[PDB]
Write an enzyme that holds these catalytic residues in place. Structure first.
Site, PDB file in Angstrom:
ATOM      1  CD  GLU A   1     -10.726  -0.812  19.522  1.00 40.43           C
ATOM      2  OE1 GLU A   1     -10.350   0.336  19.849  1.00 40.43           O
ATOM      3  OE2 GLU A   1      -9.937  -1.690  19.101  1.00 40.43           O
TER       4      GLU A   1
ATOM      5  NE  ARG B   1       5.749   2.566  -9.195  1.00 44.88           N
ATOM      6  CZ  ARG B   1       6.382   1.420  -9.426  1.00 44.88           C
ATOM      7  NH1 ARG B   1       5.991   0.307  -8.823  1.00 44.88           N
ATOM      8  NH2 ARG B   1       7.414   1.381 -10.258  1.00 44.88           N
TER       9      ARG B   1
ATOM     10  CG  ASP C   1      11.090   0.335 -11.454  1.00 44.55           C
ATOM     11  OD1 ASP C   1      12.143   0.973 -11.690  1.00 44.55           O
ATOM     12  OD2 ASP C   1      10.572   0.262 -10.319  1.00 44.55           O
TER      13      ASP C   1
ATOM     14  N   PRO D   1      -5.534  -3.401  11.079  1.00 45.58           N
ATOM     15  CG  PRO D   1      -5.753  -2.680  13.288  1.00 45.58           C
ATOM     16  CD  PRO D   1      -6.484  -2.740  11.996  1.00 45.58           C
TER      17      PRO D   1
HETATM   18  O1  LIG Z   1      -7.830   0.585  10.583  1.00 45.52           O
HETATM   19  C1  LIG Z   1      -6.646   0.674  10.904  1.00 45.52           C
HETATM   20  N1  LIG Z   1      -6.248   1.252  12.074  1.00 45.52           N
HETATM   21  C2  LIG Z   1      -7.173   1.625  13.118  1.00 45.52           C
HETATM   22  C3  LIG Z   1      -7.008   0.745  14.323  1.00 45.52           C
HETATM   23  C4  LIG Z   1      -5.799   0.692  14.994  1.00 45.52           C
HETATM   24  C5  LIG Z   1      -5.653  -0.125  16.100  1.00 45.52           C
HETATM   25  C6  LIG Z   1      -6.714  -0.893  16.546  1.00 45.52           C
HETATM   26  C7  LIG Z   1      -6.538  -1.766  17.749  1.00 45.52           C
HETATM   27  N2  LIG Z   1      -7.238  -1.207  18.891  1.00 45.52           N
HETATM   28  C8  LIG Z   1      -6.350  -1.124  20.034  1.00 45.52           C
HETATM   29  C9  LIG Z   1      -6.872  -0.166  21.033  1.00 45.52           C
HETATM   30  N3  LIG Z   1      -8.151  -0.243  21.508  1.00 45.52           N
HETATM   31  C10 LIG Z   1      -8.334   0.767  22.406  1.00 45.52           C
HETATM   32  C11 LIG Z   1      -7.127   1.426  22.440  1.00 45.52           C
HETATM   33  N4  LIG Z   1      -6.226   0.842  21.587  1.00 45.52           N
HETATM   34  C12 LIG Z   1      -7.925  -0.842  15.882  1.00 45.52           C
HETATM   35  C13 LIG Z   1      -8.060  -0.029  14.772  1.00 45.52           C
HETATM   36  C14 LIG Z   1      -5.592   0.157  10.034  1.00 45.52           C
HETATM   37  C15 LIG Z   1      -6.002  -0.430   8.858  1.00 45.52           C
HETATM   38  S1  LIG Z   1      -4.762  -1.056   7.858  1.00 45.52           S
HETATM   39  C16 LIG Z   1      -3.602  -0.522   9.010  1.00 45.52           C
HETATM   40  N5  LIG Z   1      -2.291  -0.754   8.736  1.00 45.52           N
HETATM   41  C17 LIG Z   1      -1.484  -0.311   9.656  1.00 45.52           C
HETATM   42  N6  LIG Z   1      -1.893   0.334  10.815  1.00 45.52           N
HETATM   43  C18 LIG Z   1      -3.222   0.574  11.147  1.00 45.52           C
HETATM   44  O2  LIG Z   1      -3.519   1.153  12.189  1.00 45.52           O
HETATM   45  C19 LIG Z   1      -4.158   0.098  10.125  1.00 45.52           C
HETATM   46  O1  LIG Z   2       9.399   8.628  -1.941  1.00 41.45           O
HETATM   47  C1  LIG Z   2       8.972   7.480  -1.853  1.00 41.45           C
HETATM   48  N1  LIG Z   2       8.696   6.723  -2.952  1.00 41.45           N
HETATM   49  C2  LIG Z   2       9.067   7.174  -4.279  1.00 41.45           C
HETATM   50  C3  LIG Z   2      10.164   6.338  -4.851  1.00 41.45           C
HETATM   51  C4  LIG Z   2       9.998   4.971  -4.969  1.00 41.45           C
HETATM   52  C5  LIG Z   2      11.024   4.185  -5.471  1.00 41.45           C
HETATM   53  C6  LIG Z   2      12.209   4.763  -5.881  1.00 41.45           C
HETATM   54  C7  LIG Z   2      13.304   3.891  -6.431  1.00 41.45           C
HETATM   55  N2  LIG Z   2      13.066   3.472  -7.809  1.00 41.45           N
HETATM   56  C8  LIG Z   2      14.241   2.785  -8.348  1.00 41.45           C
HETATM   57  C9  LIG Z   2      14.135   1.312  -8.313  1.00 41.45           C
HETATM   58  N3  LIG Z   2      13.586   0.530  -9.220  1.00 41.45           N
HETATM   59  C10 LIG Z   2      13.731  -0.748  -8.734  1.00 41.45           C
HETATM   60  C11 LIG Z   2      14.372  -0.751  -7.516  1.00 41.45           C
HETATM   61  N4  LIG Z   2      14.621   0.571  -7.270  1.00 41.45           N
HETATM   62  C12 LIG Z   2      12.379   6.134  -5.750  1.00 41.45           C
HETATM   63  C13 LIG Z   2      11.366   6.918  -5.229  1.00 41.45           C
HETATM   64  C14 LIG Z   2       8.763   6.870  -0.548  1.00 41.45           C
HETATM   65  C15 LIG Z   2       9.017   7.670   0.543  1.00 41.45           C
HETATM   66  S1  LIG Z   2       8.786   6.923   2.062  1.00 41.45           S
HETATM   67  C16 LIG Z   2       8.291   5.476   1.265  1.00 41.45           C
HETATM   68  N5  LIG Z   2       7.945   4.397   2.011  1.00 41.45           N
HETATM   69  C17 LIG Z   2       7.632   3.346   1.317  1.00 41.45           C
HETATM   70  N6  LIG Z   2       7.639   3.313  -0.066  1.00 41.45           N
HETATM   71  C18 LIG Z   2       7.967   4.383  -0.874  1.00 41.45           C
HETATM   72  O2  LIG Z   2       7.949   4.299  -2.095  1.00 41.45           O
HETATM   73  C19 LIG Z   2       8.342   5.570  -0.118  1.00 41.45           C
END
Ligand SMILES: O=C(NCc1ccc(CNCc2ncc[nH]2)cc1)c1csc2nc[nH]c(=O)c12
Ligand SMILES: O=C(NCc1ccc(CNCc2ncc[nH]2)cc1)c1csc2nc[nH]c(=O)c12
Lengths: 205, 243
Positions: free
Chosen positions: B116, B154, B169, B89
């Protein structure tokens, strides 16, 4: 909490419903996830789920009729008060404030698009909100929908501001690296607090 | 491209390897994803994967021996040159620039954590980079790792088939997409903007560009801050703002 899902790949959602904390939430009837596939709402032999954009250019869109019909079946299963979310790269960028807001809903319907997306008029006629999970390009809305489910499921009762300080577990010597003697000695909430601040100062601001 | 995964729930990765774009990349041998579970590296009856932090406090850490042994098995399968990424995180927040950078690697090892997290020394000795997918709290690193796989896949030549490559793209990646329409001509009494039915290519391009600029401005104005615009884009954004 009840979550309806519209996806061309409903089997992907087994990653959520069969494993870990969301899987445990499903087993304990705290969370229910139901999926409908637009492919199953097609009338033709080739089960066509895409259609050409008016105005041309590259790419296809989701075909309106199978997608709209799948959404309606999810809405009929959901009943009153279900909010319809379209997972979209053009949506509100998810953050923890957004998760807290989305988790107030007892019922959600998550619509996953493929190809270049969905007809603009379907957004007006069927969608309540649009949400993105980040500024990166994915092949579809399924991993974003799964990410949203996992984040909101943490708010279901019974399911469960600085850079963290370093943490250590056994052994005392790992690849010749030792555990700071302070941990193993007290408390002293710092060096834990001091390291949490030191790491925050030297790495992120 | 080859991707090694360390996860307590390896079956979650079937959502990537069996379906859609990534699934077809797997079937066509353009992408290979291999998973190892630390629970399979445990020696005890209860298959213990967690351990207590030194210095106490709440929470557990992943047990070092089963996790490190799983990482080593992935490293032996990878061979030379594999970058080891820890999903956490507090890691670097993923964006398209980060995806493009990660996509230069022919081999990656993705380490997912639970509890954790992992021992600090393991970060120093086994991890090359730390990455997050967004400012939201998840239950683990699996959905972030799958999200990272989908984004980088991709960039593998042949994964997007006969359509434009991820590189080509990217040439329009700065602004949000314009609205798009398909059949029927009339949906709940709502019609398609007439310019899209005109067959006037430049009028269509300029209408879509003006819509793209208006949607970016209204929904995500921060995206315009660090953006160099052409004279046409500046003139069109002004028009949409004055309407
Ligand atoms: O491993 C992941 N998440 C699990 C996680 C989330 C929060 C904490 C912190 N502990 C706080 C706490 N302790 C007690 C209560 N609360 C530790 C681990 C993760 C990986 S990439 C990513 N990218 C976006 N979001 C994410 O959560 C992730
Ligand atoms: O449906 C999802 N992705 C499919 C998708 C990705 C890109 C395009 C547009 N392509 C045209 C273009 N070329 C260059 C600039 N624009 C259309 C559809 C999606 C849902 S939530 C989300 N959140 C984070 N990222 C994601 O991709 C998503």
């Amino acid at each position: 909490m009840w979550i309806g899902v519209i996806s061309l790949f409903p089997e992907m959602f087994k990653a959520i419903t069969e494993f870990g904390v969301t899987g445990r939430a499903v087993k304990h009837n705290l969370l229910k996830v139901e999926c409908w596939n637009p492919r199953d709402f097609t009338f033709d032999k080739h089960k066509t789920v895409d259609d050409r954009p008016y105005g041309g250019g590259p790419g296809m869109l989701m075909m309106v009729q199978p997608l709209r019909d799948a959404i309606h079946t999810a809405k009929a299963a959901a009943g009153e008060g279900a909010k319809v979310i379209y997972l979209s790269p053009q949506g509100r960028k998810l953050d923890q404030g957004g998760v807290t807001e989305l988790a107030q809903n007892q019922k959600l319907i998550l619509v996953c698009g493929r190809y270049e997306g969905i007809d603009e008029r379907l957004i007006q006629t069927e969608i309540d909100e649009e949400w993105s999970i980040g500024d990166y390009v994915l092949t579809g809305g399924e991993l974003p929908a799964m990410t949203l489910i996992d984040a909101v499921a943490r708010f279901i009762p019974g399911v469960l501001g600085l850079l963290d300080c370093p943490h250590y577990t056994r052994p005392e010597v790992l690849e010749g690296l030792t555990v700071p003697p302070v941990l193993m000695s007290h408390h002293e909430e710092i060096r834990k607090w001091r390291l949490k601040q030191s790491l925050q100062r030297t790495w992120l601001r």
